[model samples]
Target chain A: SGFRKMAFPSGKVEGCMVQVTCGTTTLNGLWLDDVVYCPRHVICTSEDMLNPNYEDLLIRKSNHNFLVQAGNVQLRVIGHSMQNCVLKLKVDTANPKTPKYKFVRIQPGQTFSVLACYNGSPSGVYQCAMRPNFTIKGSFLNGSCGSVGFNIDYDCVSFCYMHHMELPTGVHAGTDLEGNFYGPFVDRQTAQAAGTDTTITVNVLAWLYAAVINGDRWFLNRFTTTLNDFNLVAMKYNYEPLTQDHVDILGPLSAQTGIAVLDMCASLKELLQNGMNGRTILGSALLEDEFTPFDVVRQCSGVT
Target chain B: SGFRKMAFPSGKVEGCMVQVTCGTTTLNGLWLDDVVYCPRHVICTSEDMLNPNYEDLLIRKSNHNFLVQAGNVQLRVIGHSMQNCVLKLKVDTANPKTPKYKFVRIQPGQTFSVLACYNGSPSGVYQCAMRPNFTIKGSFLNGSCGSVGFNIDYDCVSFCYMHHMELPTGVHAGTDLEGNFYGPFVDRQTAQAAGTDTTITVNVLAWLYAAVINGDRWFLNRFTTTLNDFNLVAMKYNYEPLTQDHVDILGPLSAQTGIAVLDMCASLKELLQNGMNGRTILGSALLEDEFTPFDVVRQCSGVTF
Candidate 1:
């Protein structure tokens, strides 16, 4: 059977159809042929991308994406006159000064824009170095590996940006008073002063510094660990038994390590839930089995 | 009370307890602050934005600024890798071989770096346009005009530009090109040559595009005439007779207008769905004894821009 790409609020796949029956959450976005929800999967020609019901909506699953960041911190895509909508923000838990937005009525085929700005930084990556409540385990890609993962006591930050294809570099646009043309600001003032619109536009940025760590560090821990867990469970059928030496080296991160290992798992689940990924998986099968629960892999995978 | 911002699948908002009392529908984004709900006219508080159990989600409410988009779109923040996300594309309907994109996960705090390469294009106002469904009924500043408007049958193109606030002219960078970029490639080879491991930078262009005219002929006509009728009804309540010219103007658009207009009212259950300055009334409130139907204005606002 022709395999089709499936969508979920969690992540992506190259070619596959996520069986809803599976314990995994299923939420995704499809290229618009007409509207938002395609009547038929791409493998079979049934519905056009431009389904008027979706009316240019990429996500037609539910109104979950709406009414976010109200009272707490906000990010919005203000379409012409805010009608034809059916959602609203309840309240802000982070900070209460900012009022949440609510859509009264939205229009179809209306081209709109987004604006996301917030201040409630997370408590930041807790690098207190004490007996951690939880820790993320993984190796850094940039050779910043550590013997053991850092135990952050605070909350983490999550931000989103679309991957764009075009980007520019700097040139010899002249030096400044200090004669420094190659440093941080990069004598690109001519370039900077020129682009007053649509150049490296920042859509939504929320600071979780209170939960804390540098930008790269904050995401690195969670990313590597998740990828590792997915690999562990998905590849279990093709299981690889570690040599004693290997186990000794990575034992700290393994589930067999100690209570710390379990603690990390719990924290990881929370990270996924509070982050954007939870919006897709919360009600689905994968949500309940956050730590790649043994039953989930066993139920789906044949006895290898 | 201070407002808080929360994330949902659609967009971000500031609130506490969020409930979707309305039926199921796709939501790309939402703004809860300036939202106007009917039946219970209460400004939702931060306490309301957070932690409304799953059951409350099924309940849909009438809101106006719910954002929805078309095409393959998803978001990712820093500190998270978007892998193994729940992909739920409907391939049986459209076929995945057609290059579909579904947003599986997002990390809100991640800093984005430029991924593609570009040869600095000049910064100026580049204009573009799409074919029109016509039916142009526009509101200036606020919706304070007649309902019966224009039913235009033509293509309209407007000009706008891409710029960098921090950078000066001729040298700018960022990646968010939706439409309107004419050439740097003579052929695919040239395009490939331009495509290398380029620098990634995000530039935020701060400018606003207040809609000059919307191509939705149906909405334009219906909304305008309804506003006019409300004005007329208000006038009649004051014993003022309406002229044929009044009715003649805002008519054709009602049939073509999208269902959003009535759906909003029906969903909210309020008479003041459209603002006071809406097309129907020229800054006058509808009398408690008089209520104007969306249809009345549909007939009056027939012409389009």
Candidate 2:
């Protein structure tokens, strides 16, 4: 249960939460809401597409989809017509300008199935719609997106072992859960002129984990100034703290890939030495598993 | 003595030690040499430009100049004329193909006081000349260029103090002694595609210093395959072991700038616990000064040239 969408007659949409400002205009925002989707067979066999609501079994796909589900992140157009159409996706957080473009050409009887993924948005998707050429006009859809509680906590703990080698900033930009475009402020032209690239994903969770350890606010307020605001969203979602299951996922990734997850585990323990009273559930759980080794995954996974 | 220049009748020049290979041709090489230059007064006062030989007191200017004095490295062109002229300078080591371009437009009677500097090349200037339109003819003059022995040692030692921040490989290509263009083999296009910039200098000496302290060759050969070759060149040039003088110069730079020279000093001492016998003079000197503080400048400088 995230913030609900509210619209004003003044062509303004609220509930996206993040403020987008260009040369003159500023668009306010809302939080992304998670939704359930029917499987391929369910959509074709029943009245699922007609209602597009009722579900029997939940689909476990973790990745966010914009068109079919219209979940908390990314966008698309919803239309019912026989005309060919062009689809455009605009990410409000990327820049005030520069909307991503796409095409959707359809025959008379085709049910359009097209959805696009935009990386590095921590807030959510901006606007999605069909171009002006179609007679069967459609409306735009938007959503907020990110993994819930414990997963985010583990994401943060993962950084201590992943020493930044080639990265100039050691901060990756692709970890935006809200689907906001955030990274180093260098412009595309300057980045290109100097032969610099930022194609890698930044571990936002890991970065936050570092902030907690180093007590450095540089990582805290880096991408978004409103990070603590997420505490409200977390409360609304009933987000729990780190757990055995959380540490279990990191075990195989660390053992197989050599990322030093155990080192991170030990570091979290040392940080807890400062006392856990002032921290959140996320902090408490990491402190709880201080001496836990990487082999804890096998212990928890029932492999031995 | 350093290597001499040779020319094939086909116009290819050799003796520039580093290999030069393009689509088809490859020229293998010799190390660079160091030379001195006669001053403008000396050249105009006597047969210096004509004979271009014989010097009295050694003239020492820290930076390189093409005409005034062709010191330690690189190459230059020489010419004389009754007609107006233009001059250019080039270094093979900076970029194998790209030559630095400078133009000096002179009137018919202009005495033409102009010289260019190339750093890190001990051999001499490679090519310097008047443009083709000049009716007057000119020749070429070359000489070795470098800082005095102690300054170079400091320049080398300074690298050890300035640690790399973002470099995945500690190899800094911008430290070309002659200010040549160099860096990791990662192409600029690829580096740009990945958001990398090469306009920064790397602390090769610092990396080597770390290797000596950490005992890691991974730091040693991160850049060139043969950094030890510089050791041979150092021996050839009578490059002394690190001395109090070397530590002294590093003193102000480190204290004022906070470059961690003292930390390096402490690290070097820790390396000395193993005994100095196995280390080179370069290693021995760094280890020797492990305990000496940075204020050793007053201890070594005579306060005069």
Candidate 3:
């Protein structure tokens, strides 16, 4: 090729090494081809080596900008710029109620994952926007946290499961989705013995006992277990939530037992699947996380 | 002034005592001066008196018209004509999703008063109508039970109380018109120490216990007592009903307990007056009637009683 064509001694590429010297200089035993271009063994340097130590280009003294995308039951915030900043996440709804605000601080280049939940349960869709540039000093980028908005329209069946008096219609223990109990109190034996359509109905209370007390550890497991196990029944009967007045009509058990059953129902929402039930499960989980200790305690104490 | 005008005898009035004779025309006990026109007393007989045995003139033996007027929680059926007929009252409500039908046979002039309640509780407006002439043979006045529409829109607090998971707002225990608690359990203490609102509340509960349980002869007094005691607290709060998630949360008590509480709530409507708690007195009475051995046993046995 050309006389000025330069090549490395062996097994080396463009970025591997590069060297230069004055004319006629014998550096590292390599013969000099020209005085103008003294051949020398290229050595690697910390600075010239692409620095492979490449640090963050946008040094964030403070103020990070980001976008938060809400999922079915989760929230993902991606940091666009590299400064550490705090975000004020404002959640609003079509309802005339006040918008809820939450503050979250993040380090540089960190993505924040949050749960979009309400009152210890999943909720309806919300209009979510963030106030970006907030820092410890309360400084804002451009004196404001952008007005960009997004939607969180996650189906929240969990909230319904937790708040409503009963579960989905078909998800009951004894009766098939239509709520036909086998003459009330038809034990497993009698139900099997009587080869009628009614015989197939489950003894809801007994079934609940098996699922809640026997299976789960919590005292409330009784109701929760029934609520979930009945989901299978509900699935069989197409899709229906628990709505039989008979369920409500059950007389008082002891206080402890009654409380346990209620707790189970409250907690049962966690296991819901299908479309609506799953949404309920999501909403309920969110509610669990969002409520404060005081809120939880008060609600648990039957204050409201 | 006229000849028809006659003066009364001493100590006697017109038609007192008079006698008339035939041909000779001599009357007994007549004055000589008035002999030409004898002064005699007048007397009346069964035939002479006006016959006053009035009857239902409009009665047709076959066709008897009637009007049904809805009263406060009741229906008054007035028989327009005298005829022994049976009226089939059908009360249908949107919320309950079922129609309750009752038959009442009335005598010619009887006013049949029927209680318009749903599931043993007061309910919202019902579209109540009557099917007249529905007797053993199922005969219709016009080849059919006439479609007579009447609205049963009572106060229906019982319906609201029964349907809602909680109570009316502004009602709580240990406070008047607020949710303030005198303390967790101030009632037992005041009754034990010096006798106060707590005493009153306990009296309410005790009274309820006797009414809901002893009278009903069931051992469910334990829960009913607490439920009613809590109701007194509810009453103290003016008109609030139980709204605590705990109440709604108490997952399916036996059918009996749930129905009992529902009955109590329905009866509670009677206790609610304008702007405040009325006599819960009506409540205890309802608790007595609302529950039955059949109701209690069926629910207890896991039936949808």
DockQ, per model, reads 0.01, 0.02, 0.01
* Tens digit of per-residue lDDT, candidate 2, span A169-193: 2222111122212223221112311
Error of 2 at A284 (Å): 22
Q: Considering DockQ, which of the candidate structures 1 and 3 is the better prediction for this target? A: 1
Candidate scoring better on TM-score of 1 and 2:
2
lDDT winner, 2 or 3: 2
Candidate 1 stretches with Cα past 4 Å from truth are: A1-228, A232-304, B1-157, B162-262, B265-305
Chain B only, TM-score of each candidate: 0.14, 0.20, 0.17
**Model 1 — interface RMS deviation?**
26.2
Better of 1 and 3 by lDDT: 3
Q: Alpha carbon lDDT of residue A192, candidate 3?
A: 23
Interface RMSD value for candidate 2, one decimal? 35.5
Q: Tell me the spans in candidate 2 whose CA falls farther than 4 Å from its real position.
A: A1-240, A243-253, A256-263, A275-304, B1-305
lDDT of 3: 0.20
- Candidate with top lDDT is 2
Which regions of candidate 3 fall more than 4 Å away from where they truly are?
A1-163, A166-304, B1-55, B60-290, B297-305
Q: Give the lDDT of residue B46 in candidate 1.
A: 30
Global lDDT of each candidate: 0.18, 0.22, 0.20
Candidate closer to the true structure by TM-score (higher is better), 2 or 3: 2
Query: Which residue window of length 10 is worst by lDDT in model 3 chain A?
Result: A1-10
